Design an enzyme around this catalytic site. Sequence first.
Site, PDB file in Angstrom:
ATOM      1  N   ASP A   1       2.919   8.417   2.871  1.00 36.59           N
ATOM      2  CA  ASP A   1       1.484   8.356   2.462  1.00 36.59           C
ATOM      3  C   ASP A   1       0.649   9.394   3.206  1.00 36.59           C
ATOM      4  O   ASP A   1      -0.061   9.060   4.118  1.00 36.59           O
ATOM      5  CB  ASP A   1       0.888   6.961   2.631  1.00 36.59           C
TER       6      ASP A   1
ATOM      7  N   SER B   1      -7.673   4.066   6.291  1.00 38.71           N
ATOM      8  CA  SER B   1      -6.669   4.895   5.603  1.00 38.71           C
ATOM      9  C   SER B   1      -6.895   6.371   5.958  1.00 38.71           C
ATOM     10  O   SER B   1      -8.046   6.816   5.951  1.00 38.71           O
ATOM     11  CB  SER B   1      -6.660   4.631   4.161  1.00 38.71           C
TER      12      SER B   1
ATOM     13  N   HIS C   1      -3.017   8.379  -0.775  1.00 39.08           N
ATOM     14  CA  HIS C   1      -3.856   7.467  -1.587  1.00 39.08           C
ATOM     15  C   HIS C   1      -5.340   7.782  -1.363  1.00 39.08           C
ATOM     16  O   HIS C   1      -6.128   7.430  -2.201  1.00 39.08           O
ATOM     17  CB  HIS C   1      -3.458   6.004  -1.350  1.00 39.08           C
TER      18      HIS C   1
END
Lengths: 697, 697
Positions: free
Chosen positions: B200, B633, B62
């Site tokens: 991810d 992230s 992402h």
Amino acid sequence: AEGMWVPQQLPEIAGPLQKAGLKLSPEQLANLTGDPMGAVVALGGCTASFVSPQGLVVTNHHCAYGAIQLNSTAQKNLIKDGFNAPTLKDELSAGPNARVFVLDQITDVTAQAKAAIAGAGNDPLARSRALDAFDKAQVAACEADAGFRCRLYSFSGGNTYRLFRNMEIKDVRLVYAPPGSVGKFGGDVDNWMWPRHTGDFSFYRAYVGKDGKPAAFAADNVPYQPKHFLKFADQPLGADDFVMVAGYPGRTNRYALAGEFNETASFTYPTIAKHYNAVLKMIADAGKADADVKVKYAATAASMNNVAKNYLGQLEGFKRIDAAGQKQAEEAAVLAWLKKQGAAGKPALAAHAQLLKHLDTSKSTRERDLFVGQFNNTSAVGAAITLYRLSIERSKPDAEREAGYQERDLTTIEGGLKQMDRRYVAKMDQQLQTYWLDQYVALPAAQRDNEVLNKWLAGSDAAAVKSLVNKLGGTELGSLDTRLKWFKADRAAFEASNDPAIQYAVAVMPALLKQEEQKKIREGESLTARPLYLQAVADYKKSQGEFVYPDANLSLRITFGNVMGYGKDGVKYTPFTTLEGVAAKETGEDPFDSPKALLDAVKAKRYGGLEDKRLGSVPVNFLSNLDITGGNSGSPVLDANGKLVGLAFDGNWESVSSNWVFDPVMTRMIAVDSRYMQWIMQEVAPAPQLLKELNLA
Amino acid sequence: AEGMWVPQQLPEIAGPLQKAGLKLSPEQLANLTGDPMGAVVALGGCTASFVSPQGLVVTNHHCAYGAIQLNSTAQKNLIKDGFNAPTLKDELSAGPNARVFVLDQITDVTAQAKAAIAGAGNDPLARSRALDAFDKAQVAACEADAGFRCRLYSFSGGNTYRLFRNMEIKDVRLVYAPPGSVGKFGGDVDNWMWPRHTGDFSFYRAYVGKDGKPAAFAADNVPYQPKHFLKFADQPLGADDFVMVAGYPGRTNRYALAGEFNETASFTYPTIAKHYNAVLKMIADAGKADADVKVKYAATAASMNNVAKNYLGQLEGFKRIDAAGQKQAEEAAVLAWLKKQGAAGKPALAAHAQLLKHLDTSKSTRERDLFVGQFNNTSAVGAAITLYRLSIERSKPDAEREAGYQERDLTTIEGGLKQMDRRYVAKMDQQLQTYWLDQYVALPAAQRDNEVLNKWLAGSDAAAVKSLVNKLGGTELGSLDTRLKWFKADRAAFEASNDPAIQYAVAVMPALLKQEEQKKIREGESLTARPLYLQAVADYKKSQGEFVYPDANLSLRITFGNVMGYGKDGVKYTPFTTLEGVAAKETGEDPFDSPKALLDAVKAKRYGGLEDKRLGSVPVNFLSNLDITGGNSGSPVLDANGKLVGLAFDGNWESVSSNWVFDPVMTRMIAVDSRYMQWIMQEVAPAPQLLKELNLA
């Protein structure tokens, strides 16, 4: 444990029961009019149980929902608010059609039923007539004594017939409902879900005439005095503890043909889901414009929400366990296993073949039949058809009247016309009519072939729908007095009437009777086929060592197992929720808006002496690996000593597909803990007179 | 453990880190340019880490989503397909604005910073200009050497200022992305949820020129050779194992005023969630019509969905932890504790009352400011405003140009205009303009006091918006070559244009500048109040022996704790998910549509030697009680010995409210397991060139 065991199977689950931790003797369960089975009652579509010698009955809130709705108004909304009857005289009639069925007797009539059917030879309508006349004859002989209602049950596709005799209590009164924010906490968001925090309980009281016999509502009526009632557990229910349920599961389809399943999954479930959610948004919008619509349609809305969510659930369920593949697999495995079995295997093969060709029919017509069926079941039009149909049947001698229209049924029809008063609003009915007609006129022309409806529409657009609803708006059947006049009326007044709903009923009745005869022929055809195939499926399940119990058929069943959670990847569902889980879900807004008294007692840890040390709080709901379905709502959950530890009210999301393909790993019953019931009645929506009558005060 | 600890707080956390199970010495971690901390890089908005001596960089899918999207077309959709660069020359440019920041130096400039502020005296605006002039001076000097980028950080409301010096890699290339059905398995359904089944991760490569110096994309550039890179863990990660994250969390609001939190809960979050969900529906609809709009708007859609869902999760978390009650109690307690101190307390109480004044200002025009803000940030209008603004700033000397319009910023602005080429469809932009214009014209007359916009609308209905959008449609800022022309054009050229988007930028710019000066006046007022109040809150918090650490501010932080699940009433979340969990969620429909290779591999139990015996399968994601937020992230999760066990990518539903009020019970980081990443690159979307380079082949 898997299985909805009939009482006559108690010998084969005796060992399994004791091993799971039943401490009672299995032959104590064998006495179905004894302690405790004799306390278990049927409500028609729900279970309940006696919990006092003054006829106090405990069931789920969602089971009492009908009766609470009948007693509610926009101003005095008992669904929203509690209800509590401090005294006998405060108790409200649950309505004319409210029933408590107390089991008296079960008689196996298989040999006589099979002789009645065989006596008709190869004629399928003759077979259906023969079984119907056998049913009527057994029921008439059995109902000879006042106060008893009897029912013939067909088990395992017609391999077994049993005649149940019940004392039918006709005066059922609402004693206690918690507020809807407790009874229905989490509403449709938490429905079919765990974790659950729903206080799904309510209390009725059974009444009888002064003379002891069942009677309709009368001020003179006295509480029924049950032979047997359950006691709330004094032993704290804990993880792994034995539990059992006795109740009246309505219908399972575990023995359905792969083809019956496929129809249901590809058409019925998605179509009903889709149309119900559309109707629901319509009723909700109507309810916002007029609180009286919200109250008058609150039972329908609750029921349609339940089904629609369940149908979605089942669809996800079927994807989760590949039900299509397992149905396929098991069907083919039965047909092969039947082949190897030389001589005796041929009739079951033939029976299968017969049952197969039965799926062929409804392909192009299934949308049309749903839309017309739904239109014909709107309130005013439905009443017209029911009332006209009765007038036709009145002509016939009683023993030849359609089941549902005999003398023994008249009081139920009349009570339906009466209840409709609390469940009907012309403007809402007109919107339901409009909705289902809109679906009909949107059909392809080739499927819009209902002669009568096409005549009455005179077109296939919105204007044609509006003008037919406008026309049906002229009916007088919204008036109770009108319906009760028609209830008594000769078929000639019907055939002469200018009431647009009556005229419509009169025009559609030839088609309806033809459709019903075709239904009876189909039942006749399967009355020897279905039993031989299901006997083979059973004999094949037995050969592989699987569990063999009949599909639910609204009769008394036992299930048992233990309090336990279930798992998905990354999650272990623990077997209990607690007060704090209720408080933690508080949003201050429907459906997560608990009474302040609940939020205050939980904030103060006012456990009322009901905390389980293993949880550090009062348990609310619990999971167990019991095998329950629609009809088992309100079923008492008994511990190892036959004491009430809870009420069955729901399944987890993965359980709903077990109506078709049972999944031991993820199927759980959700129950309301008897401690949460007592806690609500002590700390939140008090019922001190009830706690005393239960000997918990 | 709680806290997003700055490296300088390693002394305070040494004991706790050791208690939790850190085997590395804490002074190993104090070395921010050493091993392992020197492997950890900033992407600007995400964290990543070097995992090879050839500049290989691992981050989330992402995080790389922007770069994958820029390399995607309707015909060749790397979002849906994955991407693999089997050699250096196949690696795609991640786009002009993709950066890797390698930390060089942190220096504390607290005293200089405060002097520059004090030195300006009493005019708020003067104090604003004085910190900005100081910022620029510390930066322009620190940015002297070619390859480097510096940033002045304000900690704890301006109680601390630190200069970060970074080496800035300007040539970032996509090496590997798994298919979208792995990288974003479960899409918006599983976003912010556990259990989680999301692969991810993606790999970039850092390039520099042959000189070794940072350079923009050139075919001639060579892989950067990092001093330090993480090794993938050989020790299998289990429940309770020590884990730590180093990364760049963006912003937390734990030190916000009760009033700021109340404004965010009651207005900002519900309002952005509402409009973002309406705009997402519009984008989904246009995307369904036009595969080209779907690919071009996929980054925007992903981001808006993430924020919309986040904000709903925070609103739910606030109610679950009663965040409003906690903010009011803590503020009331600090205000009282400040009356208990005498002289020591009077400044902080002064500062508080001045901060409350700032909040009332932003209240009055908050709806107008959101709708006009969002409109001014639509693609063509935002480009016009940014391009015209820069021509204005060009007029000025560089030292005196606004932050973000300096020489050092030209490359990014020009980058933005290029990337918009892959992110713009005039007919999507018009719907966005229409939407935000529709919200503006719906406001009461009294809130509609954007003079220029009212002049340009010439009405306050759907039709007036329709005609402004038709008029702005004649813009040429849809063309990259027009934008890059305007990128180079003088103030006068702008004032000359008949491009309606530029004329709008020209028309609105004077009001934007007053609003910006007014904002600098509030920031100046805040520059002494905020530090005094936040110092008091810190003081009060230490007095209670509560953990004290600055709110996240895009600077490097350490968080640590252990692999562990969390509980909710009825639910125990286990610390790992596994391959079978991914297979069990499969629906063959977005977003639960795994590659055929993954399902085949899982159904066959092809665990490619990555099974953890304690799970019976290959782990996918895992939970831990770390304290991360937006920015973290792609943060490496390091085991006790500083080896990579996965990447931070998300939080559970209950964690997201921890942005305002930290909840230790239910706040968990969701990380992807390094074994799942290896497993995907072995068995599903092969990257045998990366398996070799990582030393896993």
